[PDB]
Amino acid sequence: AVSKGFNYGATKADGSSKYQADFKKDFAAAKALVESGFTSARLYTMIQGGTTNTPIEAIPAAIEEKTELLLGLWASGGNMDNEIAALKSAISQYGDDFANLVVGISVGSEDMYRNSVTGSKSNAGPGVEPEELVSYIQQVRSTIAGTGLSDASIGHVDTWDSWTNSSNSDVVNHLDWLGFDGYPYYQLTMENGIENAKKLFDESVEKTKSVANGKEVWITETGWPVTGPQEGDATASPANAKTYWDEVGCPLFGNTNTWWYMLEDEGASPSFGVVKSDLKTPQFDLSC
Ligand SMILES: *[C@@H]1O[C@H](CO)[C@@H](O[C@@H]2O[C@H](CO)[C@@H](O[C@@H]3O[C@H](CO[C@H]4O[C@H](CO[C@H]5O[C@H](CO)[C@@H](O)[C@H](O)[C@@H]5O)[C@@H](O)[C@H](O[C@H]5O[C@H](CO)[C@@H](O)[C@H](O)[C@@H]5O)[C@@H]4O)[C@@H](O)[C@H](O[C@H]4O[C@H](CO)[C@@H](O)[C@H](O)[C@@H]4O)[C@@H]3O)[C@H](O)[C@H]2NC(C)=O)[C@H](O)[C@H]1NC(C)=O
């Protein structure tokens, strides 16, 4: 089966922690957009907001909503010990009802991009060197071996330019699949108006595939904002977000594993959410 879902943070746009009831309402609202629906959820961390290493409360919400989970461990900033502890506790506390929903586990999100020259200046925090990322991948594989998650596939999420950076080549060799992050909206060194969005997306995916050594490339993050500042030639608007949804999203949905960015984020700038904060009014026509 092909995964179709959304990316979800551990906090709300204002930075406050999300709890089980918040995740449950999101997962249910995503299902209620199309009656092959959005039934999957990608997370960036195993750790509940406001805690040191308590399992994120998205897990019990997903069990109740039967939501598929693409788990994430955050690998930058030296906190993998707590991520691994939370993963161990999640397996222990929630058992098979949890394991049965897990489609894969991503070790790190954009850690190689933050360890690049332009990524350093993004002020998104520190990154991780390829060798340490490989060691983290091996630690997670050891952690799930023998457990209910022993059949979950291990990947990593990063930008297409970090995948194509040949110094990062050994990371690919330790993964089961590659997670693609790419936004033509942010590619301001190119002619990145909405006019060129599909071309730029397709080109970046083909670049990632060229270094994937025949392993699957999942679309773990892309989207186009409805409001926000102009980036090069790219402008945020409901019309432009709609055009990107139609040109890039509709051909992916149900064909390539895809997690859109994102369901809802009112208050954030740029705002990438496709539904308003009532979790019912779409920002544009979502039919394909
Ligand atoms: C293509 O990809 C490659 C590889 O991914 C990428 O190359 C990296 O480029 C980035 C950006 O320029 C470099 O990051 C800088 O690294 C500076 C040096 O610190 C690093 O190197 C230290 C020494 O490394 C050698 O020695 C040790 C000990 O002998 C050995 O273990 C190593 O393997 C290596 O041989 C190393 O000690 C240091 O470790 C610290 O940081 C890591 C980060 O995860 C963390 O574990 C700890 O905090 C640890 O103390 C680190 O690995 C560094 O000074 C510099 O920091 C600047 O930026 C940050 C913010 O971004 C500021 O906070 C800071 O004040 C500085 O302004 C930055 O981190 C990295 O070294 C390259 N890696 C390699 C392998 O070459 C290319 O850029 C990519 N190409 C393009 C075009 O983007």
Residue numbers in the entry: 0 to 34, 37 to 289
How is this structure described in the published paper?
To provide new insight into the glucan metabolism in the Penicillium genus, we focused on two enzymes (named G9376 and G7048) that have been previously identified in the culture filtrate of P. sumatraense AQ67100 fed with C. vulgaris biomass. On the other hand, in contrast to its predicted function, G7048 acts as a 1,3-β-transglucanase active on 1,3-β-glucan oligomers with a degree of polymerization (DP) higher than 5. Enzymatic analyses revealed that G7048 acts as a 1,3-β-transglucanase, rather than a glucanase as inferred by predictions, creating branched-glucans. The antagonizing activity between G9376 and G7048 suggests how opportunistic species belonging to Penicillium genus may feed on substrates with a composition similar to their own cell wall without incurring in self-deleterious autohydrolysis.
Moreover, since this region has been predicted to bind a glycosylphosphatidylinositol (GPI) tail for the anchoring of G7048 to the cell membrane, we decided to express a truncated variant of the protein encompassing the first 308 residues (hereafter referred to as ΔG7048). The X-ray crystallographic structure of the catalytic domain of G7048, solved at 1.9 Å of resolution, consists of a (β/α)8 TIM-barrel fold characteristic of all the GH17 family members. The catalytic site is in a V-shaped cleft containing the two conserved catalytic glutamic residues. An important feature of ΔG7048 is the absence of the so-called “subdomain” in the proximity of the helix α6, which is present in other glycoside hydrolase of the GH17 family and has been proposed to provide subsites + 3, + 4 and + 5 for substrate binding in 1,3-β-glucanase. Notably, ΔG7048 shares this peculiar feature with RmBgt17A, a protein belonging to the GH17 family, which acts as a β-1,3-glucanosyltransferase. Moreover, albeit ΔG7048 and RmBgt17A share a low amino acid identity (29%), both the catalytic glutamic residues (E111 and E222) and several aromatic residues pointed out by Qin and colleagues as involved in direct substrate binding in RmBgt17A are conserved or conservatively mutated in ΔG7048. Structural and mutagenesis studies have identified three of these residues (Y102, W157, and E158 in RmBgt17A) as crucial for transglycosylation activity toward hydrolytic activity. In the ΔG7048 structure, their topological position is occupied by the residues Y114 (Y102), Y187 (W157), and Q188 (E158) which are likely to fulfill the same proposed role in the stabilization of the transition state at subsite − 1, + 1 and + 2 during the transglycosylation reaction step. In the ΔG7048 structure, their topological position is occupied by W161, D162, Q188 and S205 which, together with the structural elements in regions 2 and 3 are likely to create a similar steric hindrance.
